[PDB]
Amino acid sequence: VDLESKRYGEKLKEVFLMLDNNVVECIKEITESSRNGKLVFFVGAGVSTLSDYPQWWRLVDKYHEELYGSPKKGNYSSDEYLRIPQIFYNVKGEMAFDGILKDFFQVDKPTNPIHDKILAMNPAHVITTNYDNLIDTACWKRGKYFSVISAEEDVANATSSRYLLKVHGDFRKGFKGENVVLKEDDYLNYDQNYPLISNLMKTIIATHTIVFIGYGLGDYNINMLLNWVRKLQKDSFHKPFFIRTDPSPIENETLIYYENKGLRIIDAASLIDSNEYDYLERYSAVMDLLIESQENKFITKDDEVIDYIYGKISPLFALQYIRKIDLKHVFEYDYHFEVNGTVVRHKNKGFGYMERFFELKESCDERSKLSKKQYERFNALFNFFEKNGVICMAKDAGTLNTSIEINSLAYHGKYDVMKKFIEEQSVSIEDDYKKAFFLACLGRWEESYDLYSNIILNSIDESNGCVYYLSQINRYRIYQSITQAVTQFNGLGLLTFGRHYKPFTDEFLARIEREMTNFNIDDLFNGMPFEFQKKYKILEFLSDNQFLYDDTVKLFELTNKVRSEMSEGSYSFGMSSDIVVLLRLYDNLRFLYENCLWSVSFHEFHQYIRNSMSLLIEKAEYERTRDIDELGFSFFGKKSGFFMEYYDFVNISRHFKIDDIKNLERSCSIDKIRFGEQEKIEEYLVGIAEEITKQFSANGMNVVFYTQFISEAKAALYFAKYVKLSEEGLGKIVKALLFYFPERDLDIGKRYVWLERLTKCNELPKSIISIIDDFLVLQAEKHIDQNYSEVSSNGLYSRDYGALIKHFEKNFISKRLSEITLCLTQDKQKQIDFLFKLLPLLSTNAKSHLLSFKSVENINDLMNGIRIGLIDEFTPEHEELIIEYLETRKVNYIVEKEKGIQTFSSNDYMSTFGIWYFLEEINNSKMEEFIGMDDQYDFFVDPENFDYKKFIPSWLKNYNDKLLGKIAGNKHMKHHVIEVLKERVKNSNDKRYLEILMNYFI
Amino acid sequence: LKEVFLMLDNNVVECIKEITESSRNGKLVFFVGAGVSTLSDYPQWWRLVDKYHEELYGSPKKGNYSSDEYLRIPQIFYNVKGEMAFDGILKDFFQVDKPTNPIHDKILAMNPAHVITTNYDNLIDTACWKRGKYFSVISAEEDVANATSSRYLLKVHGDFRKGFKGENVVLKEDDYLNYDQNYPLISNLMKTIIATHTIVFIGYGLGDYNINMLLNWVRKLQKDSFHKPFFIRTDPSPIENETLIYYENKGLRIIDAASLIDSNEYDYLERYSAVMDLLIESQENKFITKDDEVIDYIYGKISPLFALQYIRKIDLKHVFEYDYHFEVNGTVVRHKNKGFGYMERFFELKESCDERSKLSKKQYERFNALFNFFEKNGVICMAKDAGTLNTSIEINSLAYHGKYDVMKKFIEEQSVSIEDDYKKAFFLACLGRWEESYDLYSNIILNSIDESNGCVYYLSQINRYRIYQSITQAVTQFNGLGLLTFGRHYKPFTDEFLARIEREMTNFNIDDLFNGMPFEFQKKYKILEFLSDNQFLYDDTVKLFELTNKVRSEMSEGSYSFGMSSDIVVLLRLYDNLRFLYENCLWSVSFHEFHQYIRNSMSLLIEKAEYERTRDIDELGFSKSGFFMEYYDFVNISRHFKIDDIKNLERSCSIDKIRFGEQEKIEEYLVGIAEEITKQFSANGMNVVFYTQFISEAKAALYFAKYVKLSEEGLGKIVKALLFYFPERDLDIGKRYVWLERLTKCNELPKSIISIIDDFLVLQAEKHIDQNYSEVSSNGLYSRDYGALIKHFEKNFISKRLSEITLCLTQDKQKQIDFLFKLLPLLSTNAKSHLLSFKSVENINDLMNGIRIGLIDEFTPEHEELIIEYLETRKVNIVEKEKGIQTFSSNDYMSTFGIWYFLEEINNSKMEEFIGMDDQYDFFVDPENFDYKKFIPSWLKNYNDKLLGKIAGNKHMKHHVIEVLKERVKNSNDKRYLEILMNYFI
C-alpha cells in the first residue's frame, strides 16, 4: 500500500534475505563508496525517456520523412542513425537542421523522482550523456551546486570541486548542431575536437567506482569505454558496476562473458516480475533497495547488533576520555545524548540498534548465541561505554547519581611527582607524547618544543594518526605561545624582572620563525588521508587555538538561555528537581578534557569559561533569599544550593582572579555557603605551601614557571578564609605566607590583611603566635639600617601589626625583643621609633630603658606621642602645658580674629583636645572658658550648648577613632543629631552614611 | 632586492603577482627537474653513461656524448648482458645518502598543491618529513586507486625506492619510445593536472625530450584557450631575445635568472636563492609602487558586496585580515598591516580635491563610490586624529517601526526585482508566522541562480530553513495544550504543507554551505560565514555579546564619584547593540529563543546606570549623556521584555524619574498599535500564528506608562482599546483594573475617560444581568474597584445608563443585581433608596462591603456577634484533619477581622476567646508573643494606613520590629523598605 513500507518494507527485507552473495556484496560496496564520498554516477539517456523527452530515433525518422518524402518502412538500421542526418547536413544545409532542432527541443518537462533519488546519494561527480538540463534542474531545485562542463574553456575556467560533465555538450550557446555531438564525423573526430573532455573522463574513470545507470548493452559509448579498458593490465583496476532494467531475463552466457569483460552486472528483472512497460517501477525498485540499504540492519543471533557499533566506535579507542555530547556527531544525530547518561531516540528512522544493544547489555542471559569474536567485541564496547558514563536507556531513567574524576597529575599539581615522572627513560611513542605535554606548563618550553618535533618526526607510522594531528596542533599552539610570551617579556622590560630574563637565545627564535613561517592550519579541513577524514570527524574543531573553541559557542549561548530562568529574584517557590545549575556544572566539568589538551589554562579566553560559569552559579543567589522577602514556604534558612566540592575549590583557585573574587564577594554570602571535603583542600593548600617554599628558597631560571603559579597563590590563600584549616597545617601555611613570598609582589599591608582574615576565620591558640613574634623580631633587625624603607600600598603602620597579637593574648610580652631593647643605645633613632610602635608588647624594664631615650618637652611632642601612642593618658602637668598653649591660642584667637582669617587647617589639635575632655580623659573646668575656638571643640567640650549650624556630617569619615558607640549613649541631643543623618541619607548616595545609620544607629 | 626590483617592470612584476595569486588559491603546482638534484650533489647521468661506454667499447669518451648517444648506448649493453649487471651498476652508483638541500625545504615552504618530479630520487620525498607535509606517492600505475590523500607526488619515470631492478624505471630508449603503452595511467593524469592547474617549471632542461613532447602536445591541440605555463631559466650566460620571442610564440613565458643577478657562473645556489626569494614575498607587501592604490587591492575586496546596504563595523576587521581595528565608534588604527597604509592613503585623499583631480575618471568614480559606501556605514575618520563619534542611530525598515497599513499596501502590490521579491518575502514572513507561499523562497532560488548577481540563493536558503524550524516549533506548540489554549483544534497549517516540507527538508546540508558554493563565493563573501552554519554559531549571536560579561564584572566602581552613566558605557554596550540591531535589515529575526532575550540583558545595565548621579557629584542634576530614551529604545523595551522583567526592574531601579525623548513619536506608536489591534479584532479571526507573539507586544505597551502625556484623543483611543477589545483570556478584570490604574494616575482623568469607564461599567452590568455569568478575578479584584476608582478621583460622577434599571428593576434575582448592590454609593438617590428598601445588609460579605464603601463603619452588636459566629464556623472547620481545610488563602477574611481590632472597630474584647489560627496574622491580639517571621515584609509594604501615624510600633513592639526591616534592606534591594525604615515604625 502507498505511504507505507509494504512493497518497501517486509517484502524487500525477505528479498534481501534471499539475495545471493554477488548482489549483497555489490550493495555493500556501493554503500561503502557512497559513505566514503568516492561515488561517481554515469547517467544514460534511458532515464530521459522517463521524462517524455524527445527521442533521437524520432528525429531520424523525421529527417527521413522530409528527405525522401516518405519514411523508410520497417525498423531503421543502427548505422543509419548516424548516417541519414549527415547527408541531410551535406545537401540541405544548416538552416533546416537548426529549424528542426529548435522545433523539437524547445520544450520543458517535470523532473522524475529518479533524478533526486539518485541525487540524494552524495555523488562526488556525475557524468551524463544527454541534450537537456533535466538532471541539472533536479540538482538545482534540490539545492546542490554543480559546475556544468561542456567546452574546453569550461575546463580551463574551473570554479568548484563538483563536476557535471557533458560528453556531447548542452544547448546553452544556442540551438546549433556544430557545438553538440550529433553527427558521425563527430563520433569519428571526438578525440581531435574535444581532447580535454575525453582526457578528463579517462582520468575520472580510474579514480572512482563508476556505476552505470540507464544504459542498454551494445550502445556505442559503453562499447568504446570497454574497448579502452581492455587495453590495460587490469592488475589494480576496479571493475565498474552496471544497472540494466531489461523486461526479459538475461541469458547466463552473456552474463559470464560480460563478467569476464570486467563489469559486475546487477539485474532489475530478476528482482520481481513486472510489466514490460514498467521501466519506472524497476528503476524506483533498484533505487529503493540501494536506499534502504542504509537502514537494512537486520538482527539475528550473530549479526551487526554489536559489529556495526564496533566498526563505528573502533577508531575512537585511541582517545582517553571523550565527551558525551560529541557522540551525537559520531551517530550522525540518530540519537541525542544527555549529560546525565541517558540516550533518547530522537531524529531516528528504521531499526533501534541501540535499544537491542542495551537489552543485550543488561540481560546476562540470551548472550551466548553471539560468536566468540562478537563476544569480545561486546566486552570491549561495554567497557568503553561504562568508562564514558552512559547509564541506561532514556526510558529506563531514575537513580541518576554520577561524579566527576580527573586522573592527570597536572590538575592536582603534584610537582614533586611531576618531575619524578618526568626524568625516567622513554618507552613508546604514546607515553612520549604524554610526557611531552607534561613537559610544557612547567617552565621548560624549549625541551617541550624539541620533543614535539621529535614526535612529529616519526609519527607517520601511527595506525590512526590522531597523535600526528595532536602533535601538529600542539606545535602550532606552543609556537604562538612563545611568540606572545617573548612579546610580553619585551613589553615588561626591567619593570617586572630585576634582570631581564630572556627565555632563550635568539638562534632558537630564528629557527622557529623559519620553521613556522607560512603555516596556515587546515589539516583535516583540506588535506589529510580520507580514511582518517571519514572517521575522527569530531576533532574537526581542533584547528582553532583552544581544543574547544568552536564548542564553547554553544555554552556561551546556553548560559544566557538558562540564565533566562536561573537568575531572577522575583520567584520564591524554589526549584525542586532537574536543577539547571547541576546540569551546567556537569557540562562544564565535562569540558575538563584534561587527558588530551594543551595549556588550556594558559589561553586567556578559555579560562573565561571558568570565569563566567561559576560567576553565574554564584549569581544564582536570586534563588536564595527567597521566602525571606516573600511568604513562600516555612523554610527560612539562608542556605543556597551548590554544595561545592574539592574540584570547585581547585577551579576557583586556578582561574578566578583576586579582583574578581572581591567583586563577587561584594554581593554574596559565601561565608554562609557550606562545603564538604574539609581534609583534601587542606592537603592541596599544604602542597601549594611546600611548592612556594621550595621555589623561593633558591630561585633560579623559573621565570616561565613563575607566571601562573604566582597568581595561583593569590586565589588560593585569599579564598581559603572561607574554609576552616586545621591548626596543624595553619603553621605551615603561615610560614609560607610570611617569609617565602616575594617582597615586591606582597607588601606589608596586604600580608597583614590576609593574615587578619585567616586569624578571624580560624583561631590561633598557641602555635602560630611564636611565628608572628619571630617575624616581628626579624622586622626589628630589618630596621637596623635607618636608610632601609619599604613601600606600603594601604599603610606602613605597625600599630595594628602587633595590636592583633595583643588582641589574641592580653598578657603577651616578647622576651627576645625585650633583651633586644635592653642591648641598644641612642644612635639608631628609626629603631627607637619602631620600638615605640612595639611598646605594648615590651616588658616594663624595656619601657624604662627606652623612655630614657626620648621624651615630651613641648606640647607638639606630647601630641606626637599621641600619634605613636607613647602617652595614653598624660599627667596634669601636660594638661596645664596644653592649657598654657590653649591660653596662648586664646589670646592669639583675638589677634587672629582681627586678622580676618581662621587658621585651623594646620595644628588641628583643639579638635583632638576636645576629644579627651569629651572622653572624660581630662576632668577640668579650664577648657570651658576657651569655648568658641572651633566647631568640633564646641561639639565635644560643651555638647549641651553647642550650635549645630556647622552642618558637617563629613567628619563621620574620621569618627572611627572617636568611638561613636560611647557617644551613641551620650549624645545630649540624639534627636537633633539623627535628623542630620536622615537628611544626609535622603540627599546623598554615599554608603558611609548608611553604615553609621546602622553600626551606631537603629 | 628593491634595488634590483627598480628595473623589474618588464612582464615580471605582474608574473610574480599571478604566481602568488595562484598559490593563494591553491592552483600553484611545481615541476622540479634535475638541477635540484645537482644542488644536492646527486650522481649525474653522464658519469653512468661514461662507465657503460668503458664497460664495452673501452677507453673514455674521446669526443663528446651527443643527445642520442646519451640514450641508446646503455640500451646496447642491455642487448649483450643480463639485467644483473644493470642492477649491480645502479646499486654501486645509487646506494648513497645525500643531505637534503635547503631548496627542498623552501620548495615545501611555498606550499604547492601537486609536485611533479621527473628525476628518480628520494631527497624531495625525504624533505617532507622535516616540514611535516603529507603526500601520497604515485610511483607508477600499480598504485593509483589507493589514493591515500588529495596531495600527490607523481614519479614520471618511477624511482629507485623499489627500483633495484631495471624494469622499475625507464631509462633506455626502448622504454622511451613505448612509454605510453607501459604507463598509460600516468600520462592522462599528468595531462589533466597540467590542464587544470597553473604549472611552474624550475631547474629544468630547456632541450629535454620530455618538455619537447609536452610542447609538441599542448600547442598541437590547444591554440588560444590554454593558460600559458611558467618556466624559470637558470643559466650563467644571459639570454637573448630571438630565442625568447620564439618561445613566446610557442606558448610559454620565460623568467630568466640572469636579469635578476649575475654573481658568478658556479654559484647556482645564489641564482636559485634569488629567483625563489623574488617569490617569497608572496604578494603581501610592496607588490606595486604606483600611485592610485586606493583603487586596487581595496576595491576588489571592499566592494564586491555593496548590494548590502548595512555592514557591521566588526565585520570590516575580518574583511581586512585584522590588519586594522575597526572601533564601534567608527575609527580605525593599524594592527597587523606591514607596509603601505592604504587606509591612511584613502583617508588623506578623501578631503584634498587637488590630488583627487589627477585621479583617473573611472578611478575617480570608483573612489567616490567607496567614499559613499564608507560614509553610509559610518567610517568617517581615523583614531589618530578623531575625538568623539556619537551619532544618531536610525533604522529604515518599516517592520522595526511598526507600520502595518503601508505594509499591507506593499503586500498587495507586486514586485518585479529579485531584491524586491526578497523584501516581499520577508514582509510576508513578518505578517504571517507560516508563509502561505513559502515557495516565494523557491522562486528566489530559481531567479538567483538564473541571474549572475549571486549572494541571494545563500541567504534565502538560510531564511527558508529557519522558517521550516519555526513552523515545526509552532506545530510542537500546537500540541494537546495548543487545542485548549486557542479554544479548539485550529490547525492553521494543513497536513499537506507538513507532508511536503518534511520530504523537502530531509537530509538538508546544514553542516556547511560554503562547500556547495564555488571558491570565488567562499573567498569574496567570506564575511557571511558568521551566520552560514548558524548551528549556535559564533560572532553573529553571542561571541561579541559575551563581551558584556566582562563589563558585568567591571560593574564594581571604587569610592563614590565614578559613573556608570556618564562614561564610555555608551561605547561597546549601547552603540554596539544598536549597530547589531540589523546587519542587512533582511536577516530573519524569526528565531526568538536567544536574540529577543539577550536584548533584555542589554538595556539593563543602562537602566541600572540611572542612579540620578547622586553619588557621581553632590547634586543629582549633574548637568553629558542625558539618557533621553528615544523611540527606538522604547520599541526595544516594549518588544523584548516580559512582564516579570519590568516588574523586577521597578523593584530596585529608577522608573518614573527618567524622561524619554520623542514623546510624540511614542504617542503615534501607541495610537497605531491600539488602532490596529482594535481593527484586527474585527478584521479577521484569532490568526493565532501572528496573534500568539503579537499580543505580547501589546501587553508590554500597556503597563509601560507614567512616561508620556497621552493626547486627549489618543488616550481616549488607547483606553478604548480596553473597552472589551483586548481578549479577556490574557487580561481578566483584575489585570485590566491594575493596568488602567497604572495608566493616567499621573494625569487628571479628563471627562471623556470617565465616560469611557462608565460605558465599560455598563457593558459589565449587561454581562452580569445575564443571571448566569459570574465575574472571574484571579487576583480577587472585584468589579467594584472601577467604581472605587471613579468618584474617588472626581466628583458628581453619575450616569443614567444603570440607575433607571435599578429603579425599573423587576425584583427578579439578587445575583444579577449584586453589581448594583455593591455600586450602591454610585447609584441615584431614588434608585439607591429603592435598592436599600429591596435588600438589607446582614451577611458577613454585606458587612464587609458596607464598611468598605457607603453604609457605616461602626455596627450593631448583633452584626459583630454574627462575625464572631463566623469565627466559630471557622473553629469548627477542628475538622480540618490537615487535609487542606487548614489552608485559608482562598477565603481571605480572617486578617480583615483583625483589621477591625487595634483600630478601635470593636465593642468588646471577645476575640480573645478565639485563639487565632492564622499563624501569619495573630499577633494583633498577642503582640508580646509572635511567631518567628510572623510578619512577612511583602505584607509589611502592602498596607499604608495601619501604621496610623507610626503608632503601630509606637504603642507596642517598639524594638525588634525594625531588625527584620533593616536586614531586608541590607540584603535585598527595595526602596519601600527604606521608606518603612524612614518612618521608623513597622
Residue numbers in the entry:
A (entry chain A): 4 to 1005
B (entry chain E): 15 to 637, 642 to 895, 897 to 1005
From the manuscript:
Defense-associated sirtuin 2 (DSR2) systems are widely distributed across prokaryotic genomes, providing robust protection against phage infection. DSR2 recognizes phage tail tube proteins and induces abortive infection by depleting intracellular NAD+, a process that is counteracted by another phage-encoded protein, DSR Anti Defense 1 (DSAD1). Each DSR2 protomer consists of a conserved N-terminal Sirtuin (SIR2) domain, a C-terminal domain (CTD) and a middle domain (MD).
To understand the structural basis of DSR2 anti-phage defense, we expressed the full-length Bacillus subtilis DSR2 protein in Escherichia coli BL21 and determined the cryo-EM structure at 4.15 Å. This structure is referred to as the apo DSR2 tetramer to distinguish it from the complex with the Tube protein (activator) and the DSAD1 (inhibitor) bound structures reported later. In this structure, four DSR2 subunits assemble into an autoinhibited homo-tetrameric assembly, forming a ~ 480 kDa bone-shaped supramolecular complex. Two DSR2 subunits first cross over to form an X-shaped dimer, mediated by the SIR2 and MD domains. The tetramer is then assembled by arranging two such dimers in a head-to-head orientation, facilitated by the SIR2 domain. The DSR2W143G/Y148G/Y552G/V556S/F559G/N563S mutant with disruption at the dimeric interface behaves as a monomer, whereas the DSR2I259S/Y260G mutant with disruption at the tetrameric interface behaves as a dimer. As expected, in the absence of activator binding, DSR2 showed no detectable in vitro NADase activity. The same arrangement and similar active sites of the SIR2 domains in the apo DSR2 tetramer and inactive ThsA suggest that the apo form of DSR2 represents the inactive conformation of the DSR2 complex. Without phage infection, the apo DSR2 tetramer in cells adopts an inactive, loose conformation with its N-terminal SIR2 domain in a self-suppressed state.
